[PDB]
Design a protein around this ligand. Structure first.
Ligand SMILES: CCCCCCCCCCCCCCCCCC(=O)OC[C@H](COP(=O)([O-])OCC(O)COP(=O)([O-])OC[C@@H](COC(=O)CCCCCCCCCCCCCCCCC)OC(=O)CCCCCCCCCCCCCCCCC)OC(=O)CCCCCCCCCCCCCCCCC
Ligand SMILES: CCCCCCCCCCCCCCCCCC(=O)OC[C@H](COP(=O)([O-])OCC(O)COP(=O)([O-])OC[C@@H](COC(=O)CCCCCCCCCCCCCCCCC)OC(=O)CCCCCCCCCCCCCCCCC)OC(=O)CCCCCCCCCCCCCCCCC
Ligand SMILES: CCCCCCCCCCCCCCCCCC(=O)OC[C@H](COP(=O)([O-])OCC(O)COP(=O)([O-])OC[C@@H](COC(=O)CCCCCCCCCCCCCCCCC)OC(=O)CCCCCCCCCCCCCCCCC)OC(=O)CCCCCCCCCCCCCCCCC
Ligand SMILES: CCCCCCCCCCCCCCCCCC(=O)OC[C@H](COP(=O)([O-])OCC(O)COP(=O)([O-])OC[C@@H](COC(=O)CCCCCCCCCCCCCCCCC)OC(=O)CCCCCCCCCCCCCCCCC)OC(=O)CCCCCCCCCCCCCCCCC
Ligand SMILES: CCCCCCCCCCCCCCCCCC(=O)OC[C@H](COP(=O)([O-])OCC(O)COP(=O)([O-])OC[C@@H](COC(=O)CCCCCCCCCCCCCCCCC)OC(=O)CCCCCCCCCCCCCCCCC)OC(=O)CCCCCCCCCCCCCCCCC
Ligand SMILES: CCCCCCCCCCCCCCCCCC(=O)OC[C@H](COP(=O)([O-])OCC(O)COP(=O)([O-])OC[C@@H](COC(=O)CCCCCCCCCCCCCCCCC)OC(=O)CCCCCCCCCCCCCCCCC)OC(=O)CCCCCCCCCCCCCCCCC
Ligand SMILES: CCCCCCCCCCCCO[C@@H]1O[C@H](CO)[C@@H](O[C@H]2O[C@H](CO)[C@@H](O)[C@H](O)[C@H]2O)[C@H](O)[C@H]1O
Lengths: 105, 168, 80, 103, 135, 231, 383, 62, 85, 53
């Protein structure tokens, strides 16, 4: 809609103010910020870096709507059957008495 | 030497006669896939390193400067370390076609060379195989033509319940 | 007027009433095609493209063509 | 003065139009064409019989069988294929002769 | 150097086939190049006579094609299936018999879904041949 | 399998060659909004917002040559297939979308995350972003589906009504000479009225559907356009 | 210019000498550029050396900024002379075209040979070093000028149409400057009248916001190869570098008044590199001096005072306006006595045409009066 | 766009322009084919095919 | 049914059939013929464009180990849901 | 025989300038017209006064 202006360094709230799934991950819990997805989302929104949430989604949709959708449909592996036809590992070997051609030299 | 032109026929024939694919050939192809992924990873690492080296000083300051998304403390330390390491010495920071060439040509050369030599390696591996696929590869390199229906001509091994066709 | 969806265009007047009233009409200078000109039937005196060829004659010609198209096989049938 | 549409010939204008005016559209179209010819370019005989004929499949002459017969005859004659080989028949030539004498 | 990329590189003289081309342009321009011939996106002109002439011609040639090339296939299938299942069996009939059969097919086409169903459903007790007549 | 066929436009191509060997002005356009995107003066866009004009005009011409002329009996809509229309709309929509994405401006997608900071990010805003990303593709699919279904239904209805009219006209016109002629006359008048109404409705609906088909693409383009102000 | 067999023979004969001369020029220009780059890195402003980022306000796409990423080395005369700068610029053009050709060769292996034959048949994209005589050099310059004529009008029209359709000037002086900026070369444009257009367009579009199509047209008009164009920040960088060198040389000449002492051929080349003086115009020293002085005046006092040139888009338009020749008009006026629709005379007029002629002809007033009177009578009778 | 052109006031004027002459010929064909079908397909001597129950499109498409 | 049959192309002229194996092999022969000459080094972008993607796809096909059965692409009958063969 | 108009139109269209209306330029140029004699007298008087001062 309207033009977007990146926030200044002084307009960005501190990391400690961000909230996670349950509560802020302040001192003694900072390393949990890496694992909390909601805390990261809230931090990105606070830092005006909302694209980090939106860009991966849309692209993913495109990737499914364009290339992976048909790949799955035409080449995807369906559910296995109850009675499975495993490989006996007997096919392929040359017969006894066969004289293979020499390798290049 | 151009191994791809010879190997394309062999790959198509194997796909057509994949039934006689021994576990050894399957392992060979899995190793080829793994080496392709490894080559992609190393080429991407080289491209990222070249991009970072040629990046502008202000661009590096913006990327590896405040604010910190997590602000844990390790993030800031690592960013400051990398920024100091990059900005200490003088770096050739071209723009436009020059950066494109510098970042891409080495990456393309590395990836292509690795893939070509891995293709040669796979050709050698299939040559050393003692299966019907190896015999087909050797015959292809000898006569220059792909001999289809070879497995049934030389009576390659079949499951005990499917040997009736060979009964002649 | 209209003929199905085709409407006859009408020229908008350009003269005012005062100026119009001062105009002297002399149909002697008008072409013979347009005399006693009527906006509701301007082509009443228009010449025929072909002398003696009426619209009904063409309509009947088309009807006869349809009758031929539908009845010729009845008189001169052909095998598959 | 110079204008692409008025001065250049038709092939040149086509290349310019689809390279510097609508290149992404051309790329997408080529991608879609490749997909269509890679996944939507086959028709089984049963499908042809069901829907492949305007008024219905004329079973009274079976043109599909004639078409395949001509195909296989041409392939055999041109490629010099011995259809009596054991792999095609599953039995030796002598067994084939014995069967012929039997039946 | 081999071929020119410019339309200015002429291959013929300016007077080549001038007369026929002028006649063709006269045909094109007389009815179309008029103020009242305002097209809608180049497809729908403003001249009534263009519609009046083109609609009948389009319908005529489309109908001729449909009658002599498309519906003919259905008619031939009906004749073959109902009278032996083979082309020679149909040809064994006379032209008048074929005419009768084809006109019955036209009757069936006209009835479609709005007509009696005895034309294809055999009422019980009917003495006419059934589906297994030729089997 | 390779099928060789031809479109049903050869006569129309001939007419185009005959009547457009000389220049003519165009003043009436089905979708005029592709030319006037900006209505407030001093607003300008650095993006090639006028790139869609040529494609719009060509698509209008093609679809009008096909659909409008299809009302004529036995005229064939050669392109009337679901997946073919899907391919066309895929081409256009995805080409414009990839034009926006190749710009490599991620901030352009900030508006996908609906709502304000007050709303919960994970349980409200993220779900809304998911729904909108899905809604883009749904808009493409809806465009192509609508274009297909409108034509299919209209022509089915026309064929059925024409068959009924043929049946009654041929096999019940003798009632004019009979004592129940009034009923037949009433039915015939109703059939004529329905014929005229259906033709008018189809004529209008074809043009309107083309307008909507172009407007969906233009809306896709406009959703990602940003206008600067002159100073 | 179209290819020809004579030019093909010329370039084939001079192929290897041309390559050798190009290599020698490459060594010399590498030395010159090494000097210039060392001076820029040592004495350049912090923003210029660090390559400060300037992003667009709509899509935040980085592009060179005229104020920050362009710097005029006022003291470059100590290390590098004007002639060396001109040599570097010429070599930059030749090296760009040679690099594109070499890239094509490397990409396509031995399949570029017929394309090389097409290339050598035309002087548009061959280096200047391939000409070993005056006549060959004149033909090469003619080809370059032809390409400039072919390309510039499109760029000028793009700029003017976009601005006029999406914006209007603020004041009368800006209106006059804008209108006089895009006049044909047959008339002389006053730089003082035209300068305010630079600020107006800075208000509209700066060099940092230049669109990719306009950039392509400009690069075509500057004899800069455009295929593969790629992102707009590559040819944009080329343009920035070329105009930065040109501005440094211009400051040197203005300060030292070298153009007055400059000889006729060198002056013509100096104007040509600024896209001011086509060779096909056969200009004399007076006209060249007038154009050069007008260019310096357009740069303005601020250029000498602080090294700040006016908006680069407007500067490029102004200089390329000399290649915007008047639209051609050939044929005696007597040709206007002919008729164009004689072939229709045989068709005559139909009923509708006769009606229109009768109603709208010289008798139109009488017909209108009669029709209106009849309609009024009928309406009165109806009531 | 239906802006203008010759417009006959009534039937008798359709002969004042070649295009409308062709139009009225076509209309005559169109309207006169129906009576022809009435006469042909409601004829006394018209007989249904005896083998009509041997085969029909309904069994084929089913 | 009959009304549905009116939505078919009306100008079908000829139909040609060709096996995937045959024309794929012919295309491979043409590609080898054009990529064989010495003046096109294997490291050229053109050669890699020609060969690498095809090699990658074929390798992916060979490496495939699916627990389900994929019916033959070019069977005689693919309309029976209860008969993959 | 009016080459300037031709060239401008062709160039505008070839650069994606399809639109045929220019309200802003017309607004800038619509009120332009040759002056009357009295207006010329007033303008000349203004110029003479300016030159004098
Ligand atoms: C700029 C464009 C903008 C506009 C976009 C417009 C379009 C819209 C966008 C969306 C896309 C629409 C789709 C359109 C069609 C395009 C074509 C398509 O879809 O093809 C897919 C198509 C899918 O394949 P397929 O044909 O379906 O076959 C499937 C098989 O898997 C194929 O088998 P294969 O043999 O080919 O192998 C493929 C392989 C591909 O991958 C590989 O080959 C290996 C990896 C490659 C890496 C490449 C380099 C990355 C950077 C390296 C490091 C740099 C930094 C160095 C310095 C470090 C200092 C410390 O992938 C895999 O198989 C998966 C392997 C994953 C292993 C995971 C192991 C577990 C550990 C690691 C993960 C977990 C970590 C947790 C950490 C937790 C920490 C707390 O092709 C592929 O994806 C594979 C081939 C191409 C690979 C390209 C690799 C590079 C990708 C780009 C990376 C950089 C850009 C992204 C980041 C940007 C940030 C700003
Ligand atoms: C036959 C050959 C076939 C070749 C195929 C390969 C592709 C084509 C090759 C190249 C073709 C020539 C043209 C290329 C484009 C040129 C663009 C251009 O003009 O750039 C000018 C520009 C120079 O201008 P500048 O002013 O110096 O700097 C630009 C400004 O910063 C600009 O400032 P700004 O304001 O615009 O700043 C923004 C700028 C900032 O970016 C830059 O400009 C910086 C440079 C790029 C950085 C990219 C790396 C970012 C970090 C990646 C981290 C990945 C971690 C993954 C970890 C995985 C762990 C498991 O852009 C971005 O933010 C874009 C970031 C990239 C986003 C990528 C999104 C991908 C989505 C994927 C969706 C899913 C895919 C399918 C599924 C896959 C997975 C299953 O050039 C560059 O900066 C770099 C150019 C590099 C060119 C490409 C080199 C190609 C090398 C190929 C090697 C491999 C060959 C394989 C052959 C195979 C057999 C045939
Ligand atoms: C084995 C049996 C034979 C067949 C072999 C086939 C081999 C196939 C190989 C495998 C292919 C696989 C893929 C196939 C995919 C097909 C897809 C498809 O059909 O899509 C529908 C789609 C339908 O498109 P559309 O919307 O209908 O428009 C296309 C039209 O062509 C109209 O579009 P347009 O009007 O925009 O086109 C531009 C048009 C612009 O307008 C014009 O130029 C007007 C003329 C139009 C001509 C084209 C229309 C053809 C109409 C039907 C045929 C006309 C009569 C032929 C009579 C044959 C009698 C037996 O200009 C032209 O067409 C340029 C050519 C003009 C030729 C003029 C020749 C003059 C000769 C004068 C000689 C005088 C000698 C005097 C000697 C005096 C001595 C004293 O088809 C296409 O888009 C084209 C598909 C073609 C694919 C490539 C096929 C390979 C090439 C085969 C050539 C065979 C030549 C040998 C035949 C010998 C006789 C038997
Ligand atoms: C064998 C493998 C082959 C691989 C496949 C290759 C396929 C072909 C692709 C093209 C490859 C390059 C072709 C040769 C170009 C000539 C050299 C050059 O760069 O000229 C300078 C010139 C630089 O242009 P610029 O705009 O002035 O640069 C702005 C910078 O700010 C400039 O910075 P500045 O302002 O500070 O000024 C610096 C200037 C100051 O210097 C001067 O002024 C003195 C003159 C220096 C340049 C002289 C150039 C002479 C060119 C003609 C040569 C003779 C031709 C003879 C032909 C006939 C032979 C019979 O010096 C420079 O020009 C230095 C530029 C930076 C170096 C670029 C080279 C990097 C690659 C080479 C190293 C590779 C290492 C591999 C390691 C492997 C590890 C595993 O190059 C160009 O004109 C650009 C290339 C134009 C064609 C582009 C085509 C698309 C390219 C896409 C590539 C994507 C990645 C690759 C994958 C592709 C997949 C599709
Ligand atoms: C020994 C030498 C020294 C060593 C080597 C040194 C290095 C040399 C190489 C580098 C040279 C660079 C400079 C080159 C300059 C000249 C370029 C050029 O061509 O200029 C036009 C040049 C004339 O130039 P000019 O007269 O000087 O005018 C120049 C002006 O300034 C006009 O200028 P302009 O700017 O207006 O012209 C530009 C025009 C240039 O174009 C043209 O002018 C068109 C040229 C062709 C026109 C053909 C017309 C005739 C057609 C005939 C058809 C057949 C007829 C029937 C034949 C029957 C035979 C029996 O347009 C373009 O630039 C368009 C560019 C398009 C790029 C395409 C990129 C596609 C990318 C694909 C998408 C990828 C997306 C990413 C996907 C990523 C996926 C992961 O054209 C010609 O000479 C025409 C030649 C026609 C030859 C005959 C027809 C073709 C024969 C084919 C035979 C095939 C045999 C095998 C068949 C096998 C079948 C199985
Ligand atoms: C009525 C019907 C008539 C017939 C119609 C025929 C049917 C056509 C149907 C389809 C037509 C549309 C197709 C569109 C596709 C999509 C295009 C697209 O997305 O483009 C985006 C985009 C648009 O391009 P742009 O740079 O923005 O501007 C394009 C304008 O045209 C630039 O214009 P400008 O004015 O700005 O610049 C003018 C001038 C400016 O002057 C210069 O730039 C100086 C001279 C530069 C020379 C070239 C330097 C190249 C440097 C390296 C490039 C990267 C290489 C990558 C690695 C190699 C990959 C193969 O440049 C030129 O004069 C260029 C001359 C090029 C001549 C060649 C044109 C093609 C003719 C056919 C030859 C090939 C036939 C193969 C098939 C037959 C085989 C038997 O493309 C690129 O970024 C270009 C990438 C180029 C990569 C290399 C080519 C890849 C394609 C495969 C090549 C296969 C070669 C096979 C050799 C033989 C094997 C046996
Ligand atoms: C510029 C870089 C140059 C590198 C040169 C070589 C460096 C030295 C060898 C590197 C290590 C190679 O060792 C590599 O190990 C992996 C397992 O981890 C093996 O891979 C094997 O097991 C993995 C397990 O996931 C399977 O997916 C794969 O199919 C199978 O082949 C490779 O077959 C072997 O080659």
């Amino acid at each position: 809609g309207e033009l977007f202006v990146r926030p200044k360094l002084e307009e960005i709230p501190p990391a400690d103010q961000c909230r996670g799934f349950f509560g802020p991950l302040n001192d003694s819990l900072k390393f949990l910020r890496l694992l909390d997805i909601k805390w990261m989302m809230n931090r990105a929104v606070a830092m005006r870096r909302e694209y980090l949430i939106a860009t991966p989604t849309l692209f993913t949709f495109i990737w499914m709507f364009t290339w992976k959708g048909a790949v799955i449909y035409f080449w995807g592996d369906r559910a296995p059957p109850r009675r499975m036809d495993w490989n006996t590992e007997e096919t392929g070997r040359l017969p006894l008495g066969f004289k293979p051609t020499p390798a290049p030299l | 030497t151009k191994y791809e032109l010879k190997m394309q026929y062999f790959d198509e024939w194997m796909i057509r006669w994949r039934k006689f694919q021994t576990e050894s050939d399957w392992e060979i192809e899995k190793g080829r896939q793994w080496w392709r992924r490894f080559n992609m990873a190393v080429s991407g690492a080289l491209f990222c390193g070249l991009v970072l080296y040629t990046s502008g000083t202000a661009t590096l300051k913006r990327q590896y400067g405040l604010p910190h998304f997590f602000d844990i403390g390790v993030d800031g330390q690592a960013k400051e370390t990398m920024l100091k390491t990059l900005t200490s010495r003088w770096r050739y920071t071209p723009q436009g076609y020059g950066r494109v060439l510098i970042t891409g040509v080495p990456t393309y050369i590395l990836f292509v060379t690795l893939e070509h030599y891995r293709e040669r390696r796979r050709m050698q591996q299939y040559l050393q195989q003692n299966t019907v696929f190896g015999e087909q590869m050797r015959r292809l390199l000898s006569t220059g033509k792909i001999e289809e229906y070879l497995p049934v001509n030389i009576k390659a091994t079949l499951p005990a319940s499917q040997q009736a066709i060979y009964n002649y | 007027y209209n003929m199905l969806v085709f409407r006859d265009p009408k020229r908008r007047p350009q003269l005012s009433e005062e100026e119009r009233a001062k105009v002297v009409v002399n149909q002697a200078e008008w072409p013979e095609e347009f005399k006693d000109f009527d906006p509701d039937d301007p082509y009443k005196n228009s010449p025929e493209i072909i002398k003696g060829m009426s619209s009904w004659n063409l309509f009947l010609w088309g009807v006869e063509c349809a009758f031929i198209y539908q009845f010729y096989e009845l008189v001169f049938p052909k095998s598959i | 003065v110079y204008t692409r549409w008025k001065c250049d010939r038709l092939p040149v204008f086509q290349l310019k139009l689809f390279t510097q005016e609508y290149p992404m559209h051309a790329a997408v179209g080529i991608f879609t064409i490749i997909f269509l010819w890679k996944h939507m370019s086959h028709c089984s005989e049963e499908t042809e019989r069901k829907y492949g004929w305007w008024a219905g499949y004329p079973y009274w002459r079976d043109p599909i069988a004639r078409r395949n017969e001509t195909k296989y005859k041409q392939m055999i004659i041109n490629n010099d294929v011995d259809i009596t080989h054991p792999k095609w028949t599953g039995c030796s030539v002598e067994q084939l002769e014995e069967l012929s004498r039997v039946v | 150097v081999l071929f020119s990329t410019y339309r200015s590189s002429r291959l013929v003289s300016k007077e080549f086939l001038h007369g026929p081309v002028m006649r063709f342009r006269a045909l094109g321009e007389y009815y179309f190049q008029r103020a009242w011939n305002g097209t809608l996106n180049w497809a729908l002109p403003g001249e009534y006579r263009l519609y009046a002439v083109m609609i009948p011609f389009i319908y005529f040639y489309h109908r001729w094609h449909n009658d002599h090339t498309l519906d003919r296939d259905h008619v031939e299938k009906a004749m073959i299936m109902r009278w032996g299942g083979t082309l020679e069996d149909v040809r064994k009939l006379s032209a008048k018999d074929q005419l009768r059969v084809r006109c019955f097919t036209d009757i069936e086409k006209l009835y479609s879904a709005y007509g009696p169903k005895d034309t294809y459903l055999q009422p019980p007790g009917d003495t006419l041949p059934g589906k297994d007549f030729y089997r | 399998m390779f099928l060789f066929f031809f479109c049903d436009l050869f006569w129309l191509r001939l007419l185009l060659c005959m009547y457009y060997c000389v220049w003519s002005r165009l003043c009436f356009i089905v979708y005029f909004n592709c030319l006037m995107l900006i209505f407030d003066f001093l607003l300008f866009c650095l993006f090639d917002l006028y790139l869609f004009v040529g494609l719009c005009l060509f698509l209008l011409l093609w679809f009008m040559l096909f659909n409008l002329y299809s009302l004529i009996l036995y005229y064939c809509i050669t392109y009337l297939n679901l997946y073919l229309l899907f391919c066309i709309v895929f081409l256009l929509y995805i080409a414009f979308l990839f034009l926006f994405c190749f710009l490599c401006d991620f901030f352009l997608f900030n508006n996908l995350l609906v709502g304000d900071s007050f709303m919960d990010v994970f349980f409200i805003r993220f779900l809304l972003c998911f729904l909108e990303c899905f809604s883009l593709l749904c808009r493409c699919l809806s465009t192509f589906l609508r274009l297909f279904c409108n034509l299919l239904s209209s022509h089915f209805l026309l064929l059925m009504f024409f068959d009924f009219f043929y049946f009654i006209f041929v096999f019940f016109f003798y009632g004019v000479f009979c004592y129940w002629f009034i009923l037949f006359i009433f039915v015939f008048c109703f059939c004529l009225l329905f014929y005229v109404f259906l033709y008018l409705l189809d004529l209008f609906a074809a043009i309107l559907q083309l307008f909507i088909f172009c407007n969906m693409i233009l809306q896709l383009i406009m959703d990602f356009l940003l206008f600067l102000l002159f100073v | 210019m179209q290819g020809s067999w004579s030019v093909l023979k010329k370039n084939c004969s001079n192929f290897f000498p041309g390559l050798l001369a190009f290599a020698q020029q490459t060594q010399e220009a590498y030395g010159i550029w090494l000097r210039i780059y060392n001076r820029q890195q040592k004495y350049g402003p912090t923003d210029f050396v660090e390559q400060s980022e300037t992003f667009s306000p709509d899509y935040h796409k980085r592009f060179h900024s005229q104020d920050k990423n362009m710097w005029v080395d006022k003291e470059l005369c100590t290390e590098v002379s004007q002639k060396e700068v001109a040599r570097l610029m010429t070599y930059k053009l030749d090296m760009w075209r040679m690099a594109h050709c070499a890239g094509a060769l490397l990409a396509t292996g031995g399949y570029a040979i017929p394309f090389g034959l097409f290339w050598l048949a035309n002087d548009t994209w061959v280096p200047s070093s391939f000409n070993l005589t005056g006549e060959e050099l004149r033909a090469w310059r003619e080809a370059q000028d032809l390409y400039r004529y072919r390309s510039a009008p499109s760029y000028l029209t793009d700029t003017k149409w976009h601005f006029d359709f999406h914006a209007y000037p603020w004041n009368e002086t800006q209106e006059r400057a804008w209108d006089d900026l895009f006049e044909k070369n047959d008339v002389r444009r006053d730089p003082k009248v035209v300068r305010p257009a630079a600020e107006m367009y800075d208000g509209f579009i700066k060099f940092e916001l230049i669109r990719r199509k306009s950039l392509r047209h400009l690069c075509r008009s500057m004899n800069i190869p455009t295929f593969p164009m790629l992102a707009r920040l590559c040819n944009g960088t080329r343009v920035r570098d070329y105009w930065n060198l040109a501005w440094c040389e211009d400051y040197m000449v203005i300060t030292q008044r070298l153009h007055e002492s400059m000889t006729d051929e060198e002056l013509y080349d100096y104007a040509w590199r600024r896209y001011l003086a086509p060779y096909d115009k056969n200009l004399n020293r007076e006209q060249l001096m007038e154009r050069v002085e007008d260019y310096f005046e357009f740069l303005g006092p601020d250029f000498v005072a602080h090294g700040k040139a006016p908006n680069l888009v407007i500067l490029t338009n102004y200089v390329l306006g000399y290649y915007n020749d008047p639209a051609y008009l050939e044929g005696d006026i007597s040709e206007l006595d002919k008729n164009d629709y004689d072939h229709l005379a045989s068709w005559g007029k139909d009923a509708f045409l006769r009606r229109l002629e009768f109603e709208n002809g010289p008798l139109r007033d009488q017909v209108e009066a009669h029709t209106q009177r009849l309609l009024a009578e009928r309406a009165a009778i109806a009531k | 766009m239906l802006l203008g052109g010759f417009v006959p006031r009534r039937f008798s004027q359709f002969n004042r322009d070649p295009c409308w002459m062709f139009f009225i010929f076509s209309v005559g064909f169109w309207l006169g084919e129906y009576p022809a079908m009435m006469i042909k397909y409601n004829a006394r001597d018209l007989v249904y095919d005896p083998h009509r129950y041997v085969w029909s499109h309904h069994d084929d498409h089913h | 049914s009959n009304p549905a049959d009116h939505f078919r192309p009306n100008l079908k002229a000829l139909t040609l059939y060709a096996e995937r194996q045959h024309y794929v092999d012919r295309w491979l022969h043409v590609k080898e013929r054009w990529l064989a000459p010495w003046y096109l080094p294997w490291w050229s972008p053109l050669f890699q464009l020609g060969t690498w993607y095809s090699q990658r796809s074929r390798n992916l096909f060979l490496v495939e180990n699916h627990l389900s059965y994929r019916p033959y692409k070019f069977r005689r009958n693919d309309e029976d849901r209860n008969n993959p063969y | 025989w009016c080459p300037e108009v031709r060239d401008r139109a062709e160039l505008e269209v070839d650069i994606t300038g399809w639109q045929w209306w220019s309200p802003l330029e017309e607004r800038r140029l619509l009120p332009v017209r040759l002056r009357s004699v009295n207006e010329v007298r007033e303008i000349m008087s203004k110029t003479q006064a300016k030159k004098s001062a």
